[PDB]
Amino acid sequence: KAIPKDQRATTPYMTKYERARILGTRALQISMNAPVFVDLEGETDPLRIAMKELAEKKIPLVIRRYLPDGSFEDWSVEELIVDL
Amino acid sequence: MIVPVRCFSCGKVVGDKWESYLNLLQEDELDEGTALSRLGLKRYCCRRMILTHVDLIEKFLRYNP
Amino acid sequence: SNTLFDDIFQVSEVDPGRYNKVCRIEAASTTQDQCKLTLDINVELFPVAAQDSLTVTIASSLTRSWRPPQAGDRSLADDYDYVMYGTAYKFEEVSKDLIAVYYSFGGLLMRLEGNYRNLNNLKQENAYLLIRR
């Protein structure tokens, strides 16, 4: 249904399932020969690269969180607080 | 089924002492435990090597072609 | 670069609780009737019989890997016969004006009692134990 950046309600944190898919999803793309927005300090593993792409929060993705009723809340990996 | 050459455990040779052993019985009419010590088998590892073994082979031979 | 405690005690008893190589020892001082002592000890490298005249010391010196012999001609505040090294885990107050500290040498424990090491006894790991005669 769409939810404004405001009136936001979900967790401010990142569900492990979220991270893991992102991480996976990214690495996949990296190995798909995709642009990598960080200095590979000499990394050759798409995951490892993704993990870096993440600890510098430079991953162009937005998790769209869907709610039982259909409406969703979009959260970027830039925002999402990565504790774990 | 044929004596084994050398005792699995320690390795010393053995396969020759067969007839020698099987002899100190029927002829020199002795008791196993003593026969062995007389064949140089001092430790049970080897000792057991002989004492046990069953010459099935002999029964095999009794067959035909 | 100092010392931290000196005195002589007398063993009240030796207890080998199913320990063929070590016995916990308790002994009283020959000065203040307040100073009591409780200490585990290796009864194989340094036997001890009830009622003996032992000398106890401490100090934090003479933390970088430990060097084997060589010093067969170096420093040696080892004019003793038993010398361990461990840590203290607690500073208890046995009521009144009585404070006692507990020690441990990789398994061997130690308990002391009195009140004049207010500025003497430290609260750090370092602390070598000593015994002689």
């Binding site: - | - | 890997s65 060097r67 084997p68 012999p69 060589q70």
Partner: protein, 114 residues
């Protein structure tokens, strides 16, 4: 099936020096020698005798896993004394000992009857 060939317990393969020396960064003046196609028969020995060199601060070995005949060795010494040299000494020292043993043995043996 998966059984490696028995001879890989003493026969070095393609590109593998009996020795391989690496600098240990944990401490200063220390090394980690990787003795290929070797085992306790040797390791423990070098290690042991390596311990008599009063100029040696640390010496210990270990077979990283039984499936693989090879072992690591770590050595450390008094600043100003390279380990490798300490390593040699050990070996030599070992030989001299064995030599004498070889010798002294025969001697006693010849003096025997039966």
């Amino acid at each position: 099936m998966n059984a490696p060939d028995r001879f890989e317990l003493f026969l070095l393969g393609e590109g593998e020096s009996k020795l391989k020396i690496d600098p240990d960064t944990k401490a200063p003046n220390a090394v980690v020698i990787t003795f290929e196609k070797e085992d306790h028969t040797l390791g423990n020995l070098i290690r042991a005798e390596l311990l008599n060199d009063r100029k040696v601060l640390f010496a210990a070995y270990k077979v990283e896993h039984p499936f693989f005949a090879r072992f690591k060795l770590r050595i450390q010494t008094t600043e100003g004394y390279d380990p490798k040299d300490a390593l040699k000494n050990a070996c030599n020292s070992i030989i001299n000992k064995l030599g004498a043993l070889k010798t002294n043995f025969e001697t006693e043996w010849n003096l025997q009857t039966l």
